[PDB]
RNA sequence: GAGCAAACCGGAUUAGAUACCCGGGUAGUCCACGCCCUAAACGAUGCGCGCUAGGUCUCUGGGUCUCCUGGGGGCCGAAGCUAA
RNA sequence: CCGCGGUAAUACGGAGGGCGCGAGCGUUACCCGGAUUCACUGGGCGUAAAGGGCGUGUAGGCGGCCUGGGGCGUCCCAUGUGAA
């Protein structure tokens, strides 16, 4: 080109359609470990989104029981949070699964006393 | 009729043998609002001594910014006579006059000077290197000196 | 409208190719850019205009495809 | 580079040293025209034609003050050879100081240009 | 307070700075340049006049670190209420005046501005007028009020300074007698 | 809006007559004095209150500010419209200013309820912009708070005759008028 | 093709020594013709021009030659610049 | 964003208290912004990323002083257009 073109800004979440939410199907209910010093088993899930048709990894909030996510449960991805990513904890997870909504297969953690239920 | 506003006071710490010891610096602007302004920076172990020291220093070294002043010939009511662009080092500052109600639209370094300057309404722009210290401030100061009218 | 140019080519029948040159301010850049275009102009007598003449072309109804101009007259 | 830039630079450089006089530069009709405004605006004490080695030059009287940095603290070229800078009467620009423009009308200060209602390349700014 | 007769002491000094070209009368043998006293006089009138103004309430900080001058700067300085800097001009005396407290001086009487350049520079920033007995070696541009003459040589320094002091007192109404530093020679 | 108004007036700690009413901050330190805020705090806090006062949506509010911002002169008052520009210009506001209603909300309902007139034509649009030289009369069928209004003075920019229960917007009131 | 010396062949040292040390030694290092085209190819600083204190040593030319003036190489340093 | 939680956590959940200002509020997606990050406004290249190994020279970019013609750029005026 006349001048080299630099890479521009990229959107944080490509839920495609710039949509607020996208629904996908769980491929696998994996568990990833944190980075930096923190350690634990963060519960995550690969999801096949309809919109992008993209496959993504999403965080599953709440202590949950075991959690209510299985091999092929329908789920909604919020991108909850600005990015919806958990950078400090787990790289590669762009979105959060909304179970607060309790929409789809993701059930809400029951009887959660604390306010984060919201 | 010397208004006295204080730009700000900083703690300015220093380290010496096994020990930190701070002094205070106060920047004080003094002006008639009729065309005379002075800036003085004085330091002292205590904030008050510093401010008073600065005020006295500011009183010395006064400069005739051409804004409005006491009813006589008029400067520009809280605004500048004309647009000037000044480059100091990599820093370039641009000042453009504005009508009343515009406000002082500028980045902080430029703003802080223009306000004590007595300018109420201006449109500004910092371009090039924006080291506030390095030359944005110096650049602003030169820009002000340059103004005629 | 009316344009001025030179007859670059006599070769065709009843037609002449006039090369009009134009300068103008470009709307975006405002740079003064110059470009020229060739327009086929209708020459009925086929003796009217010879190569080398400077002529004024005028907007006309379509005579032929890719021809919308008639030789108004000879500038020279 | 640019003759005008050279002159502004020479004065800028000389003032820093605090030279009373300065061969601002070899004389040119345009350069002298510029200096005249510099004089009227009060930036320089004045200038004079001088002969150096049989070549015409313009001595520029520097004019400084007691308080601090030179009377002409700023002086920066704007239009430059790589990119010319032309401005409409609309955006002459304003500052506490003046800008010297060159118009078909002549070289005028920003205020003067406004009066004339003319535009032109913006040679430089001083204040 | 005058004396054109001064030709005995000051006159030219050998070395050079092209800028102080106007102040030089000509070159003598030994290649020493000679300062034209006629100009020296012109400058003194202008200079001294500035001086009469300042002594009503104003102070002048005299600065002479140079060795030839060092003793004299004290005497003439003591001779008036004025404060001097004899030994070594601490940096920031003017610029960071607050650290070394006093009131910022109205002016500075610097002997050898070239040597004393740090002091002169601080004045410029402060916009404090600068007077100086400066010769062929220094930049005239920097000095606000220049007394072109031998910057070196006690016979010279003593003369200008002592007189400048007398003028200070004379302006004061002191009616003080002749200067003691002459013995210093 | 139509949410608990009272708490907002407190906490903004600025007097807000969401009703005509009292200033003290609701919680933790109603008593303690809080004073001049920083520019930053000022900017955000200013937004919510300037808006909250009018009880108007951000969408409407934004347009008004943008216009006042472009025009020269201090944005704040020009924006403010004591009667000057925009904000107090709204018909709903004027009725409040006129004393027809005790509060701005009440005025809003009156205007919506149709108990208001402008130029005799009845207008129930609170967003209605009142221009200078318009009369804001109280609907014939209605008539009430005018009493008690009798002693109260009115902005120089406006005026009202208690008898007709009419009033006029004389001119755009300056912030000083505010 | 004298000397030197990757690889290599030996000696020693070492826990081991595919190394450093010692004895040998081929390519190569030299010449010609052609090819390769790299580098801490470094001032780690693209070229030209103008302007902005000086001091000191030095190479080369001119001068009225105990110093001035022109070109080049160093050191110290005004103003200024720099994150230092 | 930097990060917080491995038995004293102002960083997780609730509560009390506090600060700001819910007929909506918050999330997800997508576009512009911040991004002068495809630095013109408004950045840099001795040692931080960045001078090409050096030259010769093509295209191209740039061009000392004075006068006269032209008026292409440039500036001004009027007018037309710049729909809703």
UniProtKB/Swiss-Prot annotation, chain A:
There is a cross-link at residue 29 (Glycyl lysine isopeptide (Lys-Gly) (interchain with G-Cter in ubiquitin)). The keyword Metal-binding does not apply. GO terms for molecular function: structural constituent of ribosome. One of its GO terms (cellular component) is ribosome. Component of the ribosome, a large ribonucleoprotein complex responsible for the synthesis of proteins in the cell. The small ribosomal subunit (SSU) binds messenger RNAs (mRNAs) and translates the encoded message by selecting cognate aminoacyl-transfer RNA (tRNA) molecules. The large subunit (LSU) contains the ribosomal catalytic site termed the peptidyl transferase center (PTC), which catalyzes the formation of peptide bonds, thereby polymerizing the amino acids delivered by tRNAs into a polypeptide chain. Belongs to the universal ribosomal protein uS12 family. This is Small ribosomal subunit protein uS12A. It comes from Saccharomyces cerevisiae (strain ATCC 204508 / S288c) (Baker's yeast).
Curated annotation (Swiss-Prot), chain D:
GO terms for molecular function: structural constituent of ribosome. It comes from the Eukaryota. Keywords: Cytoplasm, Ribonucleoprotein, Ribosomal protein. InterPro entries: Ribosomal_uS8 (IPR000630), Ribosomal_uS8_CS (IPR047863), Ribosomal_uS8_sf (IPR035987). PROSITE patterns: RIBOSOMAL_S8. SUPFAM superfamilies: Ribosomal protein S8. The keyword Protein transport does not apply. It is found in: Cytoplasm. GO terms for biological process: cytoplasmic translation. Transmembrane segments: none annotated. Gene3D superfamilies: 3.30.1370.30, 3.30.1490.10. It holds the Pfam family Ribosomal_S8. Disulfide bonds: none annotated. GO terms for cellular component: cytosol; cytosolic small ribosomal subunit. PANTHER family: 40S RIBOSOMAL PROTEIN S15A. Belongs to the universal ribosomal protein uS8 family. Component of the small ribosomal subunit (SSU). Mature yeast ribosomes consist of a small (40S) and a large (60S) subunit. The 40S small subunit contains 1 molecule of ribosomal RNA (18S rRNA) and 33 different proteins (encoded by 57 genes). The large 60S subunit contains 3 rRNA molecules (25S, 5.8S and 5S rRNA) and 46 different proteins (encoded by 81 genes). Present with 40400 molecules/cell in log phase SD medium. This is Small ribosomal subunit protein uS8A. It comes from Saccharomyces cerevisiae (strain ATCC 204508 / S288c). The lineage of its organism: Eukaryota, Fungi, Dikarya, Ascomycota, Saccharomycotina. The gene is RPS22A.
From Swiss-Prot, chain E:
N-terminally acetylated by acetyltransferase NatA. It is found in: Cytoplasm. GO terms for cellular component: 90S preribosome; cytoplasmic stress granule; cytosol; cytosolic small ribosomal subunit. GO terms for biological process: cytoplasmic translation; endonucleolytic cleavage in ITS1 to separate SSU-rRNA from 5.8S rRNA and LSU-rRNA from tricistronic rRNA transcript (SSU-rRNA, 5.8S rRNA, LSU-rRNA); endonucleolytic cleavage to generate mature 3'-end of SSU-rRNA from (SSU-rRNA, 5.8S rRNA, LSU-rRNA); ribosomal small subunit assembly; ribosomal subunit export from nucleus. It comes from the Eukaryota. Disruption phenotype: Reduction in growth rate, a decrease in free 40S subunits, an increase in the amount of free 60S subunits and a decrease in polysome size. Belongs to the universal ribosomal protein uS2 family. Component of the ribosome, a large ribonucleoprotein complex responsible for the synthesis of proteins in the cell. The small ribosomal subunit (SSU) binds messenger RNAs (mRNAs) and translates the encoded message by selecting cognate aminoacyl-transfer RNA (tRNA) molecules. The large subunit (LSU) contains the ribosomal catalytic site termed the peptidyl transferase center (PTC), which catalyzes the formation of peptide bonds, thereby polymerizing the amino acids delivered by tRNAs into a polypeptide chain. This is Small ribosomal subunit protein uS2A. The gene is RPS0A.
UniProtKB/Swiss-Prot annotation, chain F:
Keywords: Cytoplasm, Isopeptide bond, Nucleus, Phosphoprotein, Ribonucleoprotein, Ribosomal protein, Ribosome biogenesis, RNA-binding, rRNA processing, rRNA-binding, Ubl conjugation. One of its GO terms (molecular function) is structural constituent of ribosome. It holds the Pfam family Ribosomal_S4. Residues 89-163 form the S4 RNA-binding domain. This is Small ribosomal subunit protein uS4A. It comes from Saccharomyces cerevisiae (strain ATCC 204508 / S288c). Belongs to the universal ribosomal protein uS4 family. Gene3D superfamilies: RNA-binding S4 domain (3.10.290.10). Disulfide bonds: none annotated. PANTHER family: 30S 40S RIBOSOMAL PROTEIN, 40S RIBOSOMAL PROTEIN S9.
